[PDB]
Amino acid sequence: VNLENKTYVIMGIANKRSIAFGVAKVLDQLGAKLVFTYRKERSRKELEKLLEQLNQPEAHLYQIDVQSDEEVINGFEQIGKDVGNIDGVYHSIAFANMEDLRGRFSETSREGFLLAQDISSYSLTIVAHEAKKLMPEGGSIVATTYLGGEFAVQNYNVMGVAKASLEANVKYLALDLGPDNIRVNAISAGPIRTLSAKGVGGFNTILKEIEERAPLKRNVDQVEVGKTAAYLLSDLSSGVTGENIHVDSGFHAIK
Amino acid sequence: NLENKTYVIMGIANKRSIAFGVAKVLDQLGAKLVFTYRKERSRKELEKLLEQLNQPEAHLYQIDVQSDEEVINGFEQIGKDVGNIDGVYHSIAFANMEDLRGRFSETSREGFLLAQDISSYSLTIVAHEAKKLMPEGGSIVATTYLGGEFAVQNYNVMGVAKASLEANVKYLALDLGPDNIRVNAISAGPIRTLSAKGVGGFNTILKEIEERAPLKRNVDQVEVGKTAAYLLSDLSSGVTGENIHVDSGFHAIK
Amino acid sequence: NLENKTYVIMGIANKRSIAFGVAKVLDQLGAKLVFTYRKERSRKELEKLLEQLNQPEAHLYQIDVQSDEEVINGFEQIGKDVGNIDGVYHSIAFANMEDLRGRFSETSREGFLLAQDISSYSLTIVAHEAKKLMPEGGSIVATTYLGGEFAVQNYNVMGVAKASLEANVKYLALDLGPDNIRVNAISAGPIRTLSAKGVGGFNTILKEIEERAPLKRNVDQVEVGKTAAYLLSDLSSGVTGENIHVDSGFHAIK
Amino acid sequence: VNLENKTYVIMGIANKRSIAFGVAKVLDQLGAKLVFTYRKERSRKELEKLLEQLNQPEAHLYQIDVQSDEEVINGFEQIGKDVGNIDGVYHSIAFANMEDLRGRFSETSREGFLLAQDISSYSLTIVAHEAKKLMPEGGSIVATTYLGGEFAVQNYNVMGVAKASLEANVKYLALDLGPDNIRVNAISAGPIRTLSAKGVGGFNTILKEIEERAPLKRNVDQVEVGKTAAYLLSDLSSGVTGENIHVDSGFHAIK
Numbered sequence A, D: 001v002n003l004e005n006k007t008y009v010i011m012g013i014a015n016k017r018s019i020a021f022g023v024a025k026v027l028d029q030l031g032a033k034l035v036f037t038y039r040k041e042r043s044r045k046e047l048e049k050l051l052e053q054l055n056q057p058e059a060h061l062y063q064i065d066v067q068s069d070e071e072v073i074n075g076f077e078q079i080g081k082d083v084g085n086i087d088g089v090y091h092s093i094a095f096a097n098m099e100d101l102r103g104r105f106s107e108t109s110r111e112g113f114l115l116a117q118d119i120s121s122y123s124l125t126i127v128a129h130e131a132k133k134l135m136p137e138g139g140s141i142v143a144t145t146y147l148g149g150e151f152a153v154q155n156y157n158v159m160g161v162a163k164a165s166l167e168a169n170v171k172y173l174a175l176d177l178g179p180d181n182i183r184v185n186a187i188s189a190g191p192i193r194t195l196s197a198k199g200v201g202g203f204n205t206i207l208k209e210i211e212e213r214a215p216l217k218r219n220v221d222q223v224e225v226g227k228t229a230a231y232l233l234s235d236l237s238s239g240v241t242g243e244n245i246h247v248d249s250g251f252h253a254i255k
Numbered sequence B, C: 001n002l003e004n005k006t007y008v009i010m011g012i013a014n015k016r017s018i019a020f021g022v023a024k025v026l027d028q029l030g031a032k033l034v035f036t037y038r039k040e041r042s043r044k045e046l047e048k049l050l051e052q053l054n055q056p057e058a059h060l061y062q063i064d065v066q067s068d069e070e071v072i073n074g075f076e077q078i079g080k081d082v083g084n085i086d087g088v089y090h091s092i093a094f095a096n097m098e099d100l101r102g103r104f105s106e107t108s109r110e111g112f113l114l115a116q117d118i119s120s121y122s123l124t125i126v127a128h129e130a131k132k133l134m135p136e137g138g139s140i141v142a143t144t145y146l147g148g149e150f151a152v153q154n155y156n157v158m159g160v161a162k163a164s165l166e167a168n169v170k171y172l173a174l175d176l177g178p179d180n181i182r183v184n185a186i187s188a189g190p191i192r193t194l195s196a197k198g199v200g201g202f203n204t205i206l207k208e209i210e211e212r213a214p215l216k217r218n219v220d221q222v223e224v225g226k227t228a229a230y231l232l233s234d235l236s237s238g239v240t241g242e243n244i245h246v247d248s249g250f251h252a253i254k
């Protein structure tokens, strides 16, 4: 799994705790050229500071709000002109309003539901469509999901239905872009203390339950997600597509 | 037997709708039925279909599930007209034709979100509003297709919206369970319907089921309706967050 | 309504047996019933339980599913006594107590194969023999537990034997489907039975269904029986290779 | 990856076409010390020959018929006396009578059913129990499975039910050995022309269905199972246990 002369776009670093910073640390350490995309200017600033700890000899940062067709279209188009063709995309992007991450699911608003869908699932489809233009030779696209896409986990509410959508999106992209030699997979990460986690009702309780009940008796970290991301983005996984790998201490396997 | 029971059936379009299959079965079993339809020029059509049921009176309500107000005002009116209900059969989906063929990666945002809105989110709001009519509990059933568990060529955007619907069923089942409201899906094999003409490669799937499914035949709307009767009745007490395949066994094989 | 239907119910030991839950339901629905047992004591309990049912005749056959001879001869006798049947409810499993606690990695070969034989293989041979009494088609149902889909502390060797049973259902569905025989499983939530008294941590899992499952209560034998009636009747035509969870929704959550 | 100073035990090489031999080329290339176990004298002979193709400075071969408790016990015990502690085990062992891999599954005999369970599933339980003693600090155990374990595939008949069993066996083993830091996982390989495949009814008609229908539109090979084995056997996959990775061109994902 050595990746020199590989280029990967990582979407969704906000700070040093971001899962996508785990991927980045692991890919960068394996010698890959990286390009980063962000939404808030605070994320770019965090990216500028975190690039000091990476080996990247230059900073490729692109502002892409995935709610914008044109910002995605022109973002990847630009990445293509700056660095040429890419080997894959790590997609670490999701959003839901805080109302919608606690209390009663049946009370979700249309606007809150569609917002979570647009950012957390559909952004993958359009990223894939635009990213494919930079992978004339094939490549690898990995999204980040959560077990709550597969089962009804208390509080995760609108995001779980967005992750269900995301997971199917992976399969349909896998089928569609398969003949083009682009593999499309997901990582189902265990719960990890991140900026966005602070918004999920009951997140602390779940951390403690993994540690008590999951087979490895411990929580996972971002580097662990990065290690599997390296596998999925590299040749090591050449016959794997439409797959969902649980990086979660075995929790998905137990009841 | 379903005498003294009342269900709302959403999604009848013509003689061939899956929902009319459910209608015939529940009607036969003695339930009171209320029907919702999307557009006002399909009211007269619904009115003709009802001539074949033993419904003393025709309870029809226009609801486009794309509007909160229509869902909210619709279900309120149902409550004023008929009282508490025992359950809802949801049989509603939509996607634009150009997204049910060709390359899934080329789906527009508008088309992806439209499908989610109508085929998935509609269950949430319907469940919220229908709950108000079920103080002592009841049963809600949605219609899915196997393409929300696996990628099926051409089903495309609808497949992602069914994955979403099927999650929706589980989250509603978790939320609504303490209120004694069960939420399930039926996963129907392919059936010749008005909407099915819109899906690329449909006939080819009809043929495959016959060759490859364990029962070596296709299912019909009335078979979906018999499983609906079970899900909608006390017979399926204890069963919630479930997806039952009514598909000649196709889901189990590969 | 199951008048003029005949079902074989395998594996009642006492009034707490899941299959007696099945028995009462099909009995209420009008079916003729035939019971098979292994232990002398079970026959005795059956003779006495039959006073609670409307069966005017005791159809009691000793069939230890560890013996081919007994299964074959039993089903043949059953054919001679009552004729063709419409389905079989299989409610049989066994493992040693030592294999239902402490560490799965320590399971003996003998213990492992014992559980497979009795708890999984038994359905294949039953299906084969039962087939002969179903020239027209029928329905076969086996009873599984969620521990065959996920690792559940303590269920151990039985979880592997249930994973095997659930597969068995799928392959039997595939094989027998063109003969119009459906094969399905019911996955029951935990229920205080004689056998359950041997599973380590059974009480603890009982309580946490109450706490965590969508319906926040446990299920009972009669609720399994009502789904059995669904699966064993024409209501579930179209449905095969299926696994229906009668478990208050516990399967859908995490 | 990189696997110097790791030792892996590979069970079930018969000839050059064996899936486990793909595993073996990949771990060998990656620096690993390899120990091999076999049943038939022929398999040992093939192994001595195929060993010239590898970097292994030393042949470590052990006859273990997994139908024999004392052979598994004594084999692992002796492996540990010879090479010390190991980092994991690759299990590539299954068996059924031909009788039982065509025509009607309802006709399967008891003795053939139990035979397929014994070799194809139980063997893992005991292998893991014995392998554990050589992994005081933890390690990785991978077994090999097939989609016919998740779905009724025509003809795979009794082997499907033993794969269902093998796959639950992996989950129960993960929950149990997790606190010992031992991970347990499955590879679900697509159809690969091997000695044993020659005995499965209709195997060629599936090979061609994968090509026409699987997302990647091609079949996979023993080396692709190998490269996922290396991921699963290494620290790359820390946090993954109780998992089933489909290495099958995405066929598991479509209908």
Ligand SMILES: NC(=O)c1ccc[n+]([C@@H]2O[C@H](COP(=O)([O-])OP(=O)(O)OC[C@H]3O[C@@H](n4cnc5c(N)ncnc54)[C@H](OP(=O)(O)O)[C@@H]3O)[C@@H](O)[C@H]2O)c1
Residues within 6 Å of the ligand: A011, A012, A013, A014, A015, A017, A018, A019, A020, A038, A039, A040, A041, A043, A064, A065, A066, A067, A091, A092, A093, A094, A095, A119, A144, A145, A146, A188, A189, A190, A191, A192, A193, A194, A195, A196, A197
């Ligand atoms: N931590 C966990 O337990 C957990 C578990 C499983 C999966 N995940 C998934 O992992 C991924 C990363 O989340 P995280 O936990 O690492 O949290 P995070 O560090 O807070 O990252 C979330 C990211 O989403 C980006 N984002 C949100 N909306 C966007 C938009 N419209 N356009 C572009 N970027 C947008 C944010 O960028 P800006 O800040 O610049 O807006 C941020 O970088 C998500 O898909 C999440 O669902 C998290």
Ligand SMILES: NC(=O)c1ccc[n+]([C@@H]2O[C@H](COP(=O)([O-])OP(=O)(O)OC[C@H]3O[C@@H](n4cnc5c(N)ncnc54)[C@H](OP(=O)(O)O)[C@@H]3O)[C@@H](O)[C@H]2O)c1
Residues within 6 Å of the ligand: B010, B011, B012, B013, B014, B016, B017, B018, B019, B037, B038, B039, B042, B063, B064, B065, B066, B090, B091, B092, B093, B094, B118, B143, B144, B145, B146, B187, B188, B189, B190, B191, B192, B193, B194, B195, B196
């Ligand atoms: N037919 C199959 O092979 C198959 C298989 C599995 C699952 N399903 C599912 O079964 C359900 C019923 O489909 P069907 O095949 O019976 O098709 P159908 O007869 O054409 O019915 C679909 C219904 O959805 C309604 N609908 C569409 N948009 C709506 C909206 N915005 N508000 C309210 N109603 C709306 C349609 O109304 P209008 O006529 O007014 O447009 C129609 O009544 C769907 O959920 C479908 O996904 C179908």
Ligand SMILES: NC(=O)c1ccc[n+]([C@@H]2O[C@H](COP(=O)([O-])OP(=O)(O)OC[C@H]3O[C@@H](n4cnc5c(N)ncnc54)[C@H](OP(=O)(O)O)[C@@H]3O)[C@@H](O)[C@H]2O)c1
Residues within 6 Å of the ligand: C010, C011, C012, C013, C014, C016, C017, C018, C019, C037, C038, C039, C040, C042, C063, C064, C065, C066, C090, C091, C092, C093, C094, C118, C143, C144, C145, C146, C187, C188, C189, C190, C191, C192, C193, C194, C195, C196
């Ligand atoms: N109780 C639960 O929470 C639970 C949950 C999910 C699934 N299940 C399943 O439900 C089914 C019924 O079990 P249960 O809990 O109702 O327990 P039960 O009342 O103890 O029934 C078990 C039955 O298996 C029979 N049996 C065992 N080995 C046999 C053999 N070799 N030949 C013929 N019969 C044999 C027993 O007969 P004898 O007494 O005559 O030996 C007994 O009638 C089993 O599949 C069990 O795994 C139970």
Ligand SMILES: NC(=O)c1ccc[n+]([C@@H]2O[C@H](COP(=O)([O-])OP(=O)(O)OC[C@H]3O[C@@H](n4cnc5c(N)ncnc54)[C@H](OP(=O)(O)O)[C@@H]3O)[C@@H](O)[C@H]2O)c1
Residues within 6 Å of the ligand: D011, D012, D013, D014, D015, D017, D018, D019, D020, D038, D039, D040, D041, D043, D064, D065, D066, D067, D091, D092, D093, D094, D095, D119, D144, D145, D146, D188, D189, D190, D191, D192, D193, D194, D195, D196, D197
């Ligand atoms: N090839 C495929 O398309 C395919 C696809 C998915 C999964 N698989 C799985 O892949 C694994 C490897 O099979 P393969 O295709 O590589 O075929 P293979 O080359 O024939 O290997 C099968 C191995 O099983 C060993 N074996 C059988 N019974 C044994 C016993 N009782 N004790 C010790 N070893 C025993 C054989 O050893 P001896 O020759 O010495 O008896 C042989 O090395 C199996 O688990 C199979 O189910 C194969």
Ligand SMILES: CCCCCCc1ccc(Oc2ccccc2C)c(O)c1
Residues within 6 Å of the ligand: A093, A094, A095, A096, A101, A145, A146, A148, A153, A154, A155, A156, A159, A190, A191, A192, A194, A196, A197, A199, A200, A201, A202, A203, A206
């Ligand atoms: C009850 C659930 C407890 C564990 C949650 C794990 C988790 C934590 C963070 C996640 O990311 C987001 C969640 C909501 C909105 C935005 C993001 C990125 C996320 O997707 C999942």
Ligand SMILES: CCCCCCc1ccc(Oc2ccccc2C)c(O)c1
Residues within 6 Å of the ligand: B092, B093, B094, B095, B100, B144, B145, B147, B152, B153, B154, B155, B158, B189, B190, B191, B193, B195, B196, B198, B199, B200, B201, B202, B205
């Ligand atoms: C790939 C071809 C096989 C799939 C046909 C099954 C099917 C048929 C009709 C369905 O209903 C709709 C489909 C598209 C748009 C709207 C509806 C209601 C539907 O959801 C599913």
Ligand SMILES: CCCCCCc1ccc(Oc2ccccc2C)c(O)c1
Residues within 6 Å of the ligand: C092, C093, C094, C095, C100, C144, C145, C152, C153, C154, C155, C158, C189, C190, C191, C193, C195, C196, C198, C199, C200, C201, C202, C205
């Ligand atoms: C970890 C505890 C989880 C509770 C499991 C519920 C249960 C109870 C009884 C069951 O039946 C048997 C179990 C072992 C042996 C024999 C039978 C019939 C059974 O199969 C399942």
Ligand SMILES: CCCCCCc1ccc(Oc2ccccc2C)c(O)c1
Residues within 6 Å of the ligand: D093, D094, D095, D096, D101, D145, D146, D148, D153, D154, D155, D156, D159, D190, D191, D192, D196, D197, D199, D200, D201, D202, D203, D206
């Ligand atoms: C209809 C089936 C289509 C192809 C199945 C692929 C396959 C091929 C060989 C396999 O290995 C065995 C099969 C039977 C007995 C023993 C082994 C090792 C095996 O386990 C799986």
Ligand SMILES: N[C@@H](CCC(=O)O)C(=O)O
Residues within 6 Å of the ligand: A102, A103, A199, A200, A201, A202, A203, A204
């Ligand atoms: N967000 C709080 C709980 C919020 C609530 O009670 O809804 C937590 O992390 O526990």
Ligand SMILES: N[C@@H](CCC(=O)O)C(=O)O
Residues within 6 Å of the ligand: D102, D103, D200, D201, D202, D203
């Ligand atoms: N299935 C066999 C031919 C006949 C049979 O096995 O029933 C094969 O293709 O090898």
